[PDB]
Amino acid sequence: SKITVNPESKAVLAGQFVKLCCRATGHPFVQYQWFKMNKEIPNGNTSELIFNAVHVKDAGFYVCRVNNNFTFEFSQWSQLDVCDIPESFQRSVDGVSESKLQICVEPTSQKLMPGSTLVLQCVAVGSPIPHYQWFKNELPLTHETKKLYMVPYVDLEHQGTYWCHVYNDRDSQDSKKVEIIIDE
Amino acid sequence: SKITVNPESKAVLAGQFVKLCCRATGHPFVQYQWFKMNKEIPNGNTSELIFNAVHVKDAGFYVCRVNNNFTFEFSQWSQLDVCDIPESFQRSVDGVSESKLQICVEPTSQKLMPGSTLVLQCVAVGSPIPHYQWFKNELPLTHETKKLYMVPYVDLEHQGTYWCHVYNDRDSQDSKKVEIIIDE
Ligand SMILES: [Cl-]
Ligand SMILES: [Cl-]
């Protein structure tokens, strides 16, 4: 029959306790079957899909099929993103995944020389899944929408103040504004 | 602002004309930006994302972000599946993708010997995306939910009548019931 609760797309750290939920109107008098894409997850025949301690391997797209005698309904797709980061960044994050949007890894300030690789990282967790947008000197970096902002070979033109805008539709958080100096 | 039309997950053949749609309440007085996962699709700044002649490379997960001055809303994820099949199976399918659920590639009847590889194929197109479930002698084959049903090395026990149940939530279509003989 019809679905009351659809699963949320979310970003979590590896090792954390994570659930994905699907609840029908007929609950508990319906059948549930979870899928990671077209793979029928074995023993994922319950309302909520539980990863006791997520692994990066677990990241991907999930859907839940709910049936009731005659019908069949597929839930919305849920994207599970699993980030592997050192313990040193897991401050203010326990072994249970929480929905709150929060930056775990912040960008860094660097003095590089022309020809260096510039690597900028911003890792956040939250539900709904966080989105990224990198900025340089108050302007958004066209198409820079990942945790990583990388420049293979820097010119002097790459100098400036950088930050990442992390956001969903419940919250947003700008990362530290970092300074990238390019000289010799 | 709020979203009126969310994109549907769909399966299409390569070369076909395909659209993905997102429409907000504020239309046409809003901004649209499409994404293939976290990649900001360039020039996908319109209500509908158009693939004039899809390529397999195009398959994947898409979302549309709609903003209106203050707000931001992400649509539901859409799964685009692109199947590459010979022209000989494209009968009753033109160069424009249609929503109707229909089997293009059917399983085949075979007389194999113990140790053979048994390959069973069932390819369908439709919107919402079709789902598969293989059956043997009236019983569903536990966890066989892909276009392909493959057995690397057949025993005599693999003999029987097979078919694929293709389905979404608007329609379903059973494939030809095929006979698999295992002898010598
Ligand atoms: Cl959930
Ligand atoms: Cl659509």
Same domain, A119 and A64: no
Q: Given B72, B74, B145, which is nearest A38 (Cβ)?
A: B145
Method: X-ray
DSSP annotation of B128 = S
**C-alpha A62 to ligand 1 mean position (Å):** 10
Contact predicate A104/A84, CB 8 Å = no
Count CB neighbours of B29 within 10 A: 10
Residue with tokens 């999930």: A62
Is residue A81 located within the same domain as residue A100? no
Token pair of B129 as six digits = 């995306």
d(CA B106, CA A9): 35
**Domain span at B119:** 93-184
- Pairing of the two strands A73-74 and A3-5: unpaired
Give Cβ neighbours of residue B70 (< 8 Å, ≥ 6 apart).
Answer: none
3-state secondary structure of B158: helix
Of the candidates A110, A105, A80, A101, the one whose C-alpha atom is nearest the C-alpha of residue A166 is A101
What does each C-alpha distance from B165 to A44, B133, B144, B170, B182 come to in angstroms?
A: 21, 5, 11, 14, 23
Residues followed by a gap in chain A, C→N > 2.5 Å:
none
Q: Do B101 and B20 fall within a single domain?
A: no
Assign 3-class secondary structure to chain A: CCEEECCCCEEEECCCEEEEECEECCCCCCEEEEEECCEECCCCCCCEEEECCCCHHHCEEEEEEEECCCCCEECCCEEEEEECCCHHHCCCCCCECCCCCEEEECCCCEEECCCCCEEEECEEEECCCCEEEEEECCEECCCCCCCEEEECCCCHHHCEEEEEEEECCCCEEECCCEEEEECC
**Torsion (CA) A24, A25, A27, A29 in degrees, nearest 10:** -110
Write the CATH number for A74: 2.60.40.10
The alpha carbon of residue A184 is apart from the nearest alpha carbon of chain B, in Å, by 34
Among candidates B104, B98, B99, which has minimal Cα distance to B83? B104
Same domain, B4 and B88: yes
C-alpha distances out from residue B178 to A121, B19, B156, Å: 54, 35, 16
Look at chain A and count its residues. 184
Residue of A nearest to B41 (CA): A143
Cβ atoms A24, A3 nearer than 8 A: yes
Q: Collapsing DSSP states into helix, strand and coil, what is residue B156? A: helix
Residues A149 and A114 grouped into a single domain? yes
Tell me the C-alpha distance between B104 and B83, whole Å: 10
CB contact at 8 A, A19 and A50: yes
Interface check A76 vs B, CB under 8 A:
yes
Report chain A's C-alpha Rg in angstroms. Answer: 20
Q: Which residues of chain A neighbour B167 with C-beta distances below 8 Å?
A: 72
Q: Are residues B85 and B41 in the same domain?
A: yes
- Distance separating alpha carbons of residues A135 and A140, to the nearest angstrom: 4
| Shared domain check, A85 and A3 | yes
Pair (B41, B72) in one structural domain? yes
Whether residues B68 and B31 fall in one domain: yes
Of B73, B76, B132, the CB nearest to A76: B76
Nearest in space to B116 (alpha carbons), one of B66, B152, B69:
B152
Pairing between β-strand A78-83 and β-strand A10-13 as defined by DSSP bridges? parallel
Contact B51, B18 (CB under 8 A): yes
CB contact under 8 A, A131 and B74: yes
Which residues 6+ apart lie within 8 Å of A6 measured at CB?
Answer: A22, A75, A76, A78
Do residues B53 and B37 share a domain? yes
- For residue A17, the distance in angstroms to the closest alpha carbon of chain B comes to 24
Query: Total domain count for chain B?
Result: 2
Q: Locate B144 and state its tokens.
A: 């066989």
Q: Give the end of a domain, one of A72, A92, A112.
A: A92
CA A13, CA A123: separation in Å to the nearest integer?
10
Q: Which of A92, A125, A146 is the last residue of a domain?
A: A92
Q: How far B96 CA sits from the closest chain A CA (Å)?
A: 25
Distances (CA, A) of B152 to A5, A176, B114, B117, B140: 40, 54, 10, 5, 19
Asked if B65 and B138 sit in the same domain, the reply is no
Q: How many whole angstroms separate alpha carbon B56 and alpha carbon B80?
A: 10
Q: Which residues pair with A124 in a beta bridge?
A: A103
3-class SS letters over A83-98: ECCCHHHCCCCCCECC
Buried b (16+ CB within 10 A) or exposed e, B103-140: bbbbbeebebeeebebebbbbbbbbbbbbbbbbbeeee
Q: Which two tokens stand for residue A87?
A: 């313990």
Same domain, B26 and B109: no
Residue where a domain terminates, one of A31, A57, A92: A92
